[PDB]
Paper text:
Here, we used a structure-guided strategy to engineer an inhibitor peptide with mutation-tolerant and potent binding ability against all SARS-CoV-2 variants. We named the peptide CeSPIACE (COVID-19 eliminative Short-Peptide Inhibiting ACE2 binding). For engineering, we determined approximately 2 Å-resolution crystal structures of CeSPIACE or its intermediate-stage peptides complexed with the RBDs of several strains, including WT, Alpha, Delta, BA.2, BA.5, or XBB.1.5.
We engineered mutation-tolerant CeSPIACE based on high-resolution structural information in combination with binding assays. The engineering started by referencing the RBD-binding part of LCB1 as a binding moiety for the ACE2-binding site of the RBD despite its vulnerability to mutations. The high-resolution structures identified the roles of the peptide residues and provided information on which residues to modify and how to modify them. K417 interacts with D30, but N417 does not, which increases the dissociation rate of strains such as Beta and Omicron.
Residue numbers in the entry:
A (entry chain B): 334 to 532
B (entry chain A): 1 to 39
Write the structure that this text describes.
């Protein structure tokens, strides 16, 4: 029983960050040295756990979150961050345990003339809770004008599309991000690294 | 007022993307977020 990380990383269609996709990984063995081997990984930051010790560890449950953002916004996929993405799209807790893996996808998520299939939430009345997912598309009332469910003066569709063009600089180029969460509950560990003592 | 200004900045972003200036439209998007989150 091996963990199917190819379904998450080697997936063809990624989700938008506001509707980020979560995959549960359980009852399997994971060789993180396969992912730690640079299959082109621009970011590989782990928190609460050392990246070289992933293969020696076990965890109660593993969550795999995946989405697409700008290169500018990968920094916000981290504990204690603010910004359009960290506040309105995908929020990591302070006590987060896991890794954040990202890589450039300008060769995949950039169409000549602009790829506008990836969306982000620009407007929200409050910041997100950690791991909260907001997929509501109600018109945002930014002012004192009632919106009545239509777009108008200070009444904006909450989602704005990314302008992914291959001519963009790397900061505006699309980046595919995979966030692996390592849950450590009072329960038997179901996901172990390849070098664990079967514990 | 802040209400009229936000409307014009939102319109600028939309027009910039319609003119193909995608990076400038995404940058104004980033500046709309900072503007509205003054609190
Ligand atoms: C994705 O496929 C490539 C092709 O061989 C492979 O090298 C890589 O390890 C795969 N990644 C995952 C997570 O399965």
């Amino acid at each position: 029983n091996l963990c199917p990380f190819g379904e998450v990383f080697n997936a063809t269609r990624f989700a938008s960050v506001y509707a980020w996709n979560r995959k549960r990984i359980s009852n399997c063995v994971a060789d993180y040295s396969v992912l730690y081997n640079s299959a082109s990984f621009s970011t590989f930051k782990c928190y609460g756990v050392s990246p070289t010790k992933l293969n020696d560890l076990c965890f109660t449950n593993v969550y795999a979150d995946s989405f697409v953002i700008r290169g500018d916004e990968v920094r916000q996929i981290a504990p204690g961050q603010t910004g359009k993405i960290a506040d309105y799209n995908y929020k990591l807790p302070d006590d987060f345990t896991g890794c954040v893996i990202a890589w450039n996808s300008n060769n995949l998520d950039s169409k000549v003339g602009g790829n506008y299939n990836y969306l982000y939430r620009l407007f929200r009345k409050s910041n997100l809770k950690p791991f909260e997912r907001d997929i509501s598309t109600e018109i945002y009332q930014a002012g004192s004008t009632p919106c009545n469910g239509v777009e108008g003066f200070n009444c904006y569709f909450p989602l704005q599309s990314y302008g992914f063009q291959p001519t963009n600089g790397v900061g505006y180029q699309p980046y595919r991000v995979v966030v692996l969460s390592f849950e450590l509950l009072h329960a038997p560990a179901t996901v172990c690294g390849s070098n664990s003592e079967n514990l | 007022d802040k209400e009229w200004i936000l409307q014009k900045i939102y319109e600028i972003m939309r027009r910039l993307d319609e003119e193909g200036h995608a990076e400038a439209s995404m940058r104004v998007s980033d500046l709309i977020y900072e503007f509205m989150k003054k609190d």
